[PDB]
């Protein structure tokens, strides 16, 4: 259990996450906290978009990492 940062274009969301959480899981936590549907969430880490079905661990996202949310 750890925390990461999701920056918007801005209002930084702090999330409580596990290395094993899938990206969809993370996107769902963003929805709970911001009301943005997962279908309209694009998440970027280290310059690459994060895909459904992989975990934060898979991308080597560790404690206090910053993610970037792209929104309309």
């Amino acid at each position: 259990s750890m925390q990461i940062f999701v920056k918007t274009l801005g209002k930084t969301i702090t999330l409580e996450v596990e290395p094993s959480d899938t990206i969809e899981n993370v996107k769902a936590k963003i929805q709970d906290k911001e009301g943005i549907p997962p279908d309209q969430q694009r998440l970027i880490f280290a310059g690459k978009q994060l895909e459904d079905g992989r975990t934060l661990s898979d991308y080597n996202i560790q404690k206090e990492s910053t993610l970037h949310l792209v929104l309309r």
Partner: protein, 363 residues
């Protein structure tokens, strides 16, 4: 390897755009101007096909049009956007898995052969100003069903005509799988109401043009969620609403729907494409994500576009770049790195639907 198609109305828009440039009423956007800047010929010296191909060539492998496009000429103009959103592209594909998103995909024991038709949905989201599609189909902020019908009719009919004739040439019928085009990222503020609008648009196109599509047989519409399971006879055609997020055990997008098989049908899947992107979009940046990226990754789309022979990876459900590319590399090896390194451009033959409902050259 791939074939670009557009409506007669879009061909008119392109001819008017060229004339508008030649008469000094408009200036090209940065990315069109960039492709134009590589040319020896001026615009007035080009024919309509070259001109069209260079506008299409201004697409990038990966673009997020709902958020990072400004519609003000610093990337593309609205006049270019109105054209580019109408451009579709088809190609034969090997389908290596069923198209399930994330970790849900199922590999085909033996990959199946079929076709993809990339079609951009209504762009109803923006980071900056209103889009062309917002101006076209919204009346004072409200969705107009008849206008949305007309938009999808403009964009989809050339592909339905193309595969009606190709099913004939193959002495089969067509089975077509369709996702909830435009109901995800492109829906913007209309996310909560858009689902029945898209279903209704698909029904209107099929009903209006049923007599032009005698070789289209089965339509498998899978909005994933937000719609109810249903089956409807449309002329001779069987139109099924089959949301795989609400009904379990339904056929995937890259798989024969019930009642079709390789002997009786050609299999075609529509891809929810994107105005400014190459076919596949997200997957050029290595993300097997969205209808566009999943379907590209789960086929040899990238091989048809680049001309390169990739390798399917069963573990991650993914057509990977060629080994002759990835082997030596210590980093940056996804398909978009392949295109940067090899100067690949997105430029192919173009046909337009004509007055008589036939696909033909632009002149």
């Amino acid at each position: 390897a791939y074939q670009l198609l557009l409506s007669k109305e879009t061909l008119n828009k392109i001819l008017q755009y060229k004339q508008n440039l030649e008469k000094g009423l408009a200036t090209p956007g940065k990315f069109f101007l960039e492709e134009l800047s590589k040319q020896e010929k001026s615009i007035s010296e080009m024919d309509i096909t070259t001109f069209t191909q260079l506008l299409i060539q201004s697409k990038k492998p990966q673009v997020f049009a709902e958020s990072q496009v400004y519609h003000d000429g610093t990337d593309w103009t609205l006049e270019e956007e109105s054209i580019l959103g109408d451009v579709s592209v088809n190609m034969p594909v090997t389908m290596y898995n069923d198209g399930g998103h994330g970790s849900s995909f199922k590999n085909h024991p033996k990959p199946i052969s079929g076709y993809l038709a990339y079609v951009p949905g209504a762009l109803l989201a923006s980071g900056s100003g209103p889009t062309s599609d917002m101006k076209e189909v919204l009346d004072n902020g409200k969705l107009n069903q008849d206008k949305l019908n007309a938009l999808y009719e403009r964009r989809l009919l050339p592909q339905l005509i193309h595969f009606n004739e190709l099913a004939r040439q193959n002495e089969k019928q067509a089975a077509i799988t369709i996702p909830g085009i435009g109901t995800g990222c492109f829906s913007g503020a209309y996310y909560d109401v858009i689902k029945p609008y898209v279903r209704n648009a698909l029904i209107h196109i099929l009903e209006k043009h049923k007599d032009s599509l005698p070789y289209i047989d089965i339509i498998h519409y899978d909005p994933y969620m937000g719609d109810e399971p249903a089956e409807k006879k449309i002329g001779h055609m069987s139109f099924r609403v089959s949301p795989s997020g609400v009904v379990r055990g339904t056929t995937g997008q890259l798989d024969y729907p019930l009642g079709s098989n390789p002997d009786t049908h050609i299999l075609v899947s529509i891809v929810a494409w994107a105005h400014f992107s190459w076919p596949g979009n997200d997957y050029w940046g290595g993300a097997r994500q969205t209808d566009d990226g999943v379907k590209a990754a789960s086929t040899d789309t990238m091989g048809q576009v680049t001309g390169a022979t990739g390798v399917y990876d069963k573990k991650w459900g993914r057509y990977m770049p060629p080994e002759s590319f990835t082997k030596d590399r210590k980093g940056m090896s996804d398909w978009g790195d392949y295109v940067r390194e090899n100067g690949i451009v997105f430029n192919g033959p173009v046909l337009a639907l004509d007055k008589s409902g036939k696909l033909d050259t632009l002149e």
